[PDB]
Amino acid sequence: HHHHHMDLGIAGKTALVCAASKGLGRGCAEALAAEGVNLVIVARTRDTLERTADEIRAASNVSVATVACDITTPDGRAAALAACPQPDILVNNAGGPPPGDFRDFSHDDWIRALESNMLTPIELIRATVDGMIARGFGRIVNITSSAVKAPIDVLALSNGARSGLTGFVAGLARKVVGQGVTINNLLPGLFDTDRIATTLAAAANAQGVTVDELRARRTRDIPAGRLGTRAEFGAACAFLCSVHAGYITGQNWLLDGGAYPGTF
Amino acid sequence: HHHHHMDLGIAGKTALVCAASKGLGRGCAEALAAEGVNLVIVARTRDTLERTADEIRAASNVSVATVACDITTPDGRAAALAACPQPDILVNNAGGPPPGDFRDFSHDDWIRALESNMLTPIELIRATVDGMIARGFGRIVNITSSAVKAPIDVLALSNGARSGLTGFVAGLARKVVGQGVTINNLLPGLFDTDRIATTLAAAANAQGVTVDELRARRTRDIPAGRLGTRAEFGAACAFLCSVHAGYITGQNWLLDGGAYPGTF
Amino acid sequence: HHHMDLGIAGKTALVCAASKGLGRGCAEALAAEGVNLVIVARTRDTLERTADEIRAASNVSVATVACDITTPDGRAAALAACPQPDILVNNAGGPPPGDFRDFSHDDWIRALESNMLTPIELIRATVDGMIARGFGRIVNITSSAVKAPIDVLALSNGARSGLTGFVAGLARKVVGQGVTINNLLPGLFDTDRIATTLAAAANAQGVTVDELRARRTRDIPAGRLGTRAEFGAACAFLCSVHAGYITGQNWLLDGGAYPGTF
Amino acid sequence: HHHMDLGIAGKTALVCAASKGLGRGCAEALAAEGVNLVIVARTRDTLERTADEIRAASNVSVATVACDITTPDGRAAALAACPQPDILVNNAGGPPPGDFRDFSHDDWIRALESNMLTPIELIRATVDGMIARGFGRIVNITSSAVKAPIDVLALSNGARSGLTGFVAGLARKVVGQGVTINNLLPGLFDTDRIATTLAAAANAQGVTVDELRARRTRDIPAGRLGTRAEFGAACAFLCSVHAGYITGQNWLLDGGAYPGTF
Numbered sequence A, B: 001h002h003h004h005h006m007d008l009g010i011a012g013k014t015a016l017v018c019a020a021s022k023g024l025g026r027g028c029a030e031a032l033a034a035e036g037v038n039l040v041i042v043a044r045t046r047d048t049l050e051r052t053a054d055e056i057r058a059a060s061n062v063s064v065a066t067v068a069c070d071i072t073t074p075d076g077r078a079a080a081l082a083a084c085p086q087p088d089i090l091v092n093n094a095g096g097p098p099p100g101d102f103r104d105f106s107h108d109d110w111i112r113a114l115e116s117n118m119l120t121p122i123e124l125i126r127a128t129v130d131g132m133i134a135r136g137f138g139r140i141v142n143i144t145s146s147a148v149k150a151p152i153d154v155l156a157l158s159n160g161a162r163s164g165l166t167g168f169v170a171g172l173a174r175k176v177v178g179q180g181v182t183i184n185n186l187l188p189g190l191f192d193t194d195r196i197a198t199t200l201a202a203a204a205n206a207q208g209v210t211v212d213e214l215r216a217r218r219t220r221d222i223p224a225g226r227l228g229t230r231a232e233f234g235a236a237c238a239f240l241c242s243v244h245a246g247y248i249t250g251q252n253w254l255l256d257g258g259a260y261p262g263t264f
Numbered sequence C, D: 001h002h003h004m005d006l007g008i009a010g011k012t013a014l015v016c017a018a019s020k021g022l023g024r025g026c027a028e029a030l031a032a033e034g035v036n037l038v039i040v041a042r043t044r045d046t047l048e049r050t051a052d053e054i055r056a057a058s059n060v061s062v063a064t065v066a067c068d069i070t071t072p073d074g075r076a077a078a079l080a081a082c083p084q085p086d087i088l089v090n091n092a093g094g095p096p097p098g099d100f101r102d103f104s105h106d107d108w109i110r111a112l113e114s115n116m117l118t119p120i121e122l123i124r125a126t127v128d129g130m131i132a133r134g135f136g137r138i139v140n141i142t143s144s145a146v147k148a149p150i151d152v153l154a155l156s157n158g159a160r161s162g163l164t165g166f167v168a169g170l171a172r173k174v175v176g177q178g179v180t181i182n183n184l185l186p187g188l189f190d191t192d193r194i195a196t197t198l199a200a201a202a203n204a205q206g207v208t209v210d211e212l213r214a215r216r217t218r219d220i221p222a223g224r225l226g227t228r229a230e231f232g233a234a235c236a237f238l239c240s241v242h243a244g245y246i247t248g249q250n251w252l253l254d255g256g257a258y259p260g261t262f
């Protein structure tokens, strides 16, 4: 007795997955490859990026192309679009800004954060949405942050840039959904990525605590009692990119184990 | 070259799907049956309910049991729980309250709406959540309404009862997610169900317009330019019920084609 | 200086559940702006004392209704004393905390009656007169838990969220006729009830009252509890002729404790 | 009657972009409560006239700074005139409407500079003094579009939402030191700019001004546009000593037009 399970309907489509050699972006890449989506993946570090592409090719039956570039620069965006001029799916992602107190920031800190986490996604949407509209199908997913719903004092630069992206997305989403293009944001709370692990160990050593003690501290503030996985993050991305999600647009899906306490 | 696609991981589990011989509830039932979930489906009208169960059995490889009862009464809830004492998945649903002006309502109108669309789901959660916790897995999905986010003047009884359910769910969701139980709400905007079609035709005849003219009027207020399908509603339900959604809880997923204009 | 004239002197306000705490703060602030009052509470001697104090401090009239506002006969008593209010402040005691697995159907109905249907019915009874006169101000005291429900407050989370969704729909319907409906959502305010509850939970836990107060206050970014005076001041502003473009609002007075952007 | 004393007589407010419209309404309302003002705008003759009018009506001092507040030298001019404000009202002109497919990178940067980074930098320059004095009130004029973005307002949707998320984080950090940071979100207010814009879009479309006004007003449940006086009254209330438990709030003054519950 075999069960049909869920065919997301997007085999043969193409996705441009930004910032995706590791972490959540890689989780989205893998989940889309398993649905038969051909990939162009972007990251800055060439040897890690090509290793990830090797591995996804082995693990899936799709094509994978790589672009080694800084997606937050004009030249990097041009290189990504040269390699993937007409994506059906765009996953926006880039490294987040540094923590600190805004009184200690220079103006250029704001500009860099706005470029990386707001204007870069907007520009890649600008560059790709008309082809999606012309084909009657498009899926744009922006990786943002649970901080959009509950800003953290020390993350001023992210609170601002990502809330700016979110406000822009809300307006555009309603304009293009009738042409078959959806635009939605995935808001991760704390996910078990290598970057998070590296940061945790540095923070433990700076406080004098063991890594286990600091891990437990973070987890106690998450009702789910665990960190998120890049796999379940990628699964939600793949569902938003599916033919079953064409009525869902401008949404901000919070994947945070219950941590944020608001009703909405 | 066959693609893995998405295995929701819930084959062999059991779902109690309320109010599910037709419409959105039937859409959830079918989507769960395709993932290999055995069903107990509830509705009041026996012959329609048994026809739906016949059809789902033919269409899927799962078992389907029926309970013909009014789920908004104590006896009906008891009959549903006798038939499905330990569900892994609970889909809460029931008919919505009548439209009108609250100045014309009697007290009993409020009580009936609160019973049907708030206390009935709470009681079925009360009756089933401890077994979910004991097994380390539970998925509760409540069908509510886009009105929760943007209340309509003439839907006072739904605005109130469903917002009450939503507030209760937000608090409980954070309490049980660490035990493997999630509780989330699906907020439909306008979906193409037989009830909606019947209501539209009555409204057209009461206004003197053709059905096509009234259909178009409603659609012009939906940016997606179409009504929702019970299939895509069921797909979102199945994804929330999957092993890929254990980090998602207390959320209010709006499936409305962009119609509600808020950022959040 | 031309200080702020809220323009409501000589209007009449029905202030529910207002011999003490936040309701009393609303009554004091409205009387200070010249509003004649009818104040409701169950316990006669506290009610009369509070009325006497307000009347002596403000020279408005202050009628009292000793009744349980969450019952139909109580609402009839209150409406008989104030059949045509310009201003209605909805308020009543809150439901008991606990685990929803231990709440009966009747517990749910009591909470819904007290904190959702009672305000709806008082609005139902008074709004058409406000409309007819081209002015009305309805303020519902709810709870910061409407924005961030706590698991132990299931009954409040449900009933007050229901009121909040109802209010959202009605507010838009009547604002063009000069009636606004807004909710005030208190976080922790230093009412005598809260103070007594703290001192009991202190001596119960074996810590002092000051120790428990510090624990509560650590979770409030403003570093203090709210005062009934500032709660009443916000209510008076909503009631003013300056607030007729403000409706369906949920003003959080919680010292920044709720973390959400919205 | 003891009318409402907001307790801010003799404080000093820096009011940005305030020779006309909502900023002017804020300045008028604060002066009426005894607050000394420094008001900023670009055009000298309008700025002086508005200052003269406020000074004559309120007997506070009203200094003027003729500058473009969205440039670094403009901010330096404003801060030189008002280095230690108790109250800061952030405001500037809004960005142009249009299709984001036609906006350049520089268009985005101009909007972000004008409606997000300018207020952040003015907060950055003034908040530590507020903290040191144990009192501060920061009010940011944003837009009802922050709650419901319009596709033609992409630049505003982005920049003002960014400011709003930044403010949410900072508000909780400083409220314990007596500083509140809140946003006022206007829906359609009858400022002379709006009126002129309407009369041009009227004669352009071939309809009269009254016809276009009726079309706009049909979509506002309150049935009217807002007034700068009531906008300024809300700003003054937030600035008061009664509003120290209110921070990080986004008060929608839009006559009920926005349909959301929250």
Ligand SMILES: NC(=O)c1ccc[n+]([C@@H]2O[C@H](COP(=O)([O-])OP(=O)(O)OC[C@H]3O[C@@H](n4cnc5c(N)ncnc54)[C@H](OP(=O)(O)O)[C@@H]3O)[C@@H](O)[C@H]2O)c1
Residues within 6 Å of the ligand: A018, A019, A020, A021, A022, A023, A024, A025, A042, A043, A044, A045, A046, A048, A069, A070, A071, A072, A093, A094, A095, A096, A097, A143, A144, A145, A146, A188, A189, A190, A191, A192, A193, A194, A195, A196
């Ligand atoms: N993980 C969480 O708990 C969490 C929570 C909230 C928000 N977020 C946000 O989500 C995003 C992803 O986080 P993550 O933990 O998955 O990060 P990650 O583990 O560090 O992965 C980032 C990936 O993007 C690439 N990349 C980074 N900056 C890039 C750039 N300018 N151009 C091109 N590729 C770039 C990195 O490779 P190269 O370094 O080789 O370029 C790597 O492949 C970040 O913006 C983060 O702030 C994450």
Ligand SMILES: NC(=O)c1ccc[n+]([C@@H]2O[C@H](COP(=O)([O-])OP(=O)(O)OC[C@H]3O[C@@H](n4cnc5c(N)ncnc54)[C@H](OP(=O)(O)O)[C@@H]3O)[C@@H](O)[C@H]2O)c1
Residues within 6 Å of the ligand: B018, B019, B020, B021, B022, B023, B024, B025, B042, B043, B044, B045, B046, B048, B069, B070, B071, B072, B093, B094, B095, B096, B097, B143, B144, B145, B146, B188, B189, B190, B191, B192, B193, B194, B195, B196
């Ligand atoms: N469809 C939309 O556009 C839309 C939008 C917003 C909200 N909603 C809400 O979503 C829910 C589902 O709507 P729908 O359009 O799918 O409704 P539907 O097409 O009428 O289906 C309702 C189903 O539930 C059963 N049912 C109704 N009341 C019941 C009760 N007391 N006990 C047991 N079974 C019951 C009905 O069969 P019997 O009559 O035989 O019992 C039928 O199987 C409603 O609460 C509705 O108000 C729907």
Ligand SMILES: NC(=O)c1ccc[n+]([C@@H]2O[C@H](COP(=O)([O-])OP(=O)(O)OC[C@H]3O[C@@H](n4cnc5c(N)ncnc54)[C@H](OP(=O)(O)O)[C@@H]3O)[C@@H](O)[C@H]2O)c1
Residues within 6 Å of the ligand: C016, C017, C018, C019, C020, C021, C022, C023, C040, C041, C042, C043, C044, C046, C067, C068, C069, C070, C091, C092, C093, C094, C095, C141, C142, C143, C144, C186, C187, C188, C189, C190, C191, C192, C193, C194
């Ligand atoms: N203070 C806070 O921190 C806070 C925070 C969140 C929510 N709230 C909610 O705000 C409301 C007011 O709280 P509070 O602290 O001001 O309470 P309070 O100090 O206990 O004052 C309650 C007032 O209402 C009267 N009252 C209570 N139930 C009544 C009824 N059924 N009929 C008529 N009068 C009634 C009481 O007098 P009698 O007993 O003589 O009738 C008293 O005058 C409550 O619902 C509470 O749950 C308060």
Ligand SMILES: NC(=O)c1ccc[n+]([C@@H]2O[C@H](COP(=O)([O-])OP(=O)(O)OC[C@H]3O[C@@H](n4cnc5c(N)ncnc54)[C@H](OP(=O)(O)O)[C@@H]3O)[C@@H](O)[C@H]2O)c1
Residues within 6 Å of the ligand: D016, D017, D018, D019, D020, D021, D022, D023, D040, D041, D042, D043, D044, D046, D067, D068, D069, D070, D091, D092, D093, D094, D095, D141, D142, D143, D144, D186, D187, D188, D189, D190, D191, D192, D193, D194
């Ligand atoms: N009124 C509404 O319906 C409404 C609704 C939503 C949002 N908003 C936003 O609220 C703000 C105020 O709107 P309003 O209608 O009050 O505008 P207004 O009537 O045009 O007033 C703008 C005031 O700011 C000054 N100003 C503008 N840009 C400036 C700059 N760069 N530096 C210094 N002063 C500057 C103007 O004088 P100068 O030109 O001489 O400098 C004038 O005194 C705008 O950002 C607008 O987009 C307003």
Ligand SMILES: [Cl-]
Residues within 6 Å of the ligand: none
């Ligand atoms: Cl830490």
Ligand SMILES: [Cl-]
Residues within 6 Å of the ligand: none
């Ligand atoms: Cl209609």
Ligand SMILES: [Cl-]
Residues within 6 Å of the ligand: none
């Ligand atoms: Cl405690």
Ligand SMILES: [Cl-]
Residues within 6 Å of the ligand: none
């Ligand atoms: Cl127009």
